[PDB]
Amino acid sequence: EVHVLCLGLDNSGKTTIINKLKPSNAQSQNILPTIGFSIEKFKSSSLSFTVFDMSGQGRYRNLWEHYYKEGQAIIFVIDSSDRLRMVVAKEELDTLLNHPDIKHRRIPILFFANKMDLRDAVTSVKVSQLLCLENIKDKPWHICASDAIKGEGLQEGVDWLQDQI
Ligand SMILES: Nc1nc2c(ncn2[C@@H]2O[C@H](COP(=O)(O)OP(=O)(O)OP(=O)(O)O)[C@@H](O)[C@H]2O)c(=O)[nH]1
Ligand SMILES: [Mg+2]
Secondary structure (H helix, E strand, C coil): CCEEHHHHHHCCCHHHHHHHHHCCCHHCCCCCCHHHHHHHHEEECEEEEEEEEEEECCCCCHHHHHHHHHCCEEEEEEEEEECHHHHHHHHHHHHHHHHCCCCCCCCCEEEEEECCCCCCCHHHHHHHHHHHHHCCCCCEEEEEEEEEECCCCCHHHHHHHHCCC
């Protein structure tokens, strides 16, 4: 019953995170850059998900807005270890948030400050400061640190998302 858009730059960990939310039997073992986008399903405590897992490469970011009218929730993923590319991420977040099909809907945004395990990684608090998430006033949001390979942090996000729905 719940349609989610998974957005963020390429190499942020989007497909790794979505994969980890799946039952063990359903999980992919070799995750490659997404070609355009994919549609996945996962399940939480009592919620069934359809996820538009978009490629975040520059080549395919044009596709995102085509699917905005069926984001009932957004999962936006940040590579915590890459401050330089985080400037590009913030630009895209700001465009997303101001888009005609997004700006007037109270849609919940879950952020993941992913790749928390890497030495250069910024904390979820620091990410929230850097992206200026405090400025999001008309939508519910939450941010988590995550290590998507291990699965650390994903439970809290999914739990927050489920509450919002
Ligand atoms: N160390 C570490 N590596 C991660 C983490 N999450 C994802 N990765 C790795 O980062 C690379 C990119 O992960 P993907 O899930 O393919 O990234 P993406 O956002 O889906 O990229 P696109 O589909 O190209 O937009 C892969 O090699 C993953 O194994 C993490 O939390 N920690
Ligand atoms: Mg991907």
